[PDB]
Amino acid sequence: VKELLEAGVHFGHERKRWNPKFARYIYAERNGIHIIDLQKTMEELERTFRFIEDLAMRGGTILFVGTKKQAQDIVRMEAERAGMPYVNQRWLGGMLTNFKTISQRVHRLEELEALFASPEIEERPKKEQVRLKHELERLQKYLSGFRLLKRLPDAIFVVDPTKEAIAVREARKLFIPVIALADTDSDPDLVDYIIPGNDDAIRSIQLILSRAVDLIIQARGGVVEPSPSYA
């Protein structure tokens, strides 16, 4: 499922803005840029993909977490492929530790999923009506993938654990496996199942994400091949 010629997308970056705790996954500092060693990645993917495949094999649920620009749309696709919950735009504080309370915003969502599912009564003030069509969109803008998350997840798969320290901190507090792909600017000790590598190259973000999702399909029966590897 893995590769060895994945070294043709990323092998690391981020020039001397590093976290010293990451040095045990760094091979050399060449063009001003810290270069990640992938023999450290290959062993680690063996751990992570051992965890991911074994997790879906028993009915798990991985909350995929991506927020930044270079990983915005790709995390939407890959989580929808495996039918997995994603958080796309903003990570709402408490989403995990205050789950039974933010989930109270998807019930309001399903409400406007029924209301604007013709008709209940649309014959109630259009102002009072189009008031809601904006509240509808907003809920979809932030709860589009979290809605399928009906219960506190079994693990989370984040794109950037520094950029997403809030989500990590909550999951760590709930004894939730924190699995993540991370480059030279993050804390290995905070990640339960690590994937050392670039998290800014879309050419690399999609790679370790798209063919990680592929592994999730084969663990819940049957395979599919093509996912969006847009150029």
Partner RNA sequence: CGUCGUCAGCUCGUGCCGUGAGGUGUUGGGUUAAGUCCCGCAACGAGCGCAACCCCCGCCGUUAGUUGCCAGCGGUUCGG
Q: Which residues bind RNA (CB under 7 A)?
A: 90-94, 97-98, 100-102, 104-105, 134, 138, 166, 169-170, 173
In whole angstroms, the minimum distance from the beta carbon of 105 to RNA comes to 5
Chain centroid, CA 134 distance in Å: 26
In whole angstroms, the minimum distance from the beta carbon of 90 to RNA comes to 5
With beta carbons less than 8 A apart as the criterion, state whether 166 and 172 touch: no
Rounded Cα–Cα distance for residues 203 and 126 (Å): 46
Cβ distance to RNA smaller for residue 9 or 165 = 165
User: Which structure tokens are listed for 70?
Assistant: 């270079």
User: Which structure tokens are listed for 74?
Assistant: 């790709």
Cβ distance to RNA smaller for residue 72 or 210 = 72
Rounded Cα–Cα distance for residues 193 and 44 (Å): 8
In whole angstroms, the minimum distance from the beta carbon of 51 to RNA comes to 24
With beta carbons less than 8 A apart as the criterion, state whether 59 and 222 touch: no
Cβ distance to RNA smaller for residue 101 or 229 = 101
In whole angstroms, the minimum distance from the beta carbon of 139 to RNA comes to 8
Cβ distance to RNA smaller for residue 170 or 185 = 170
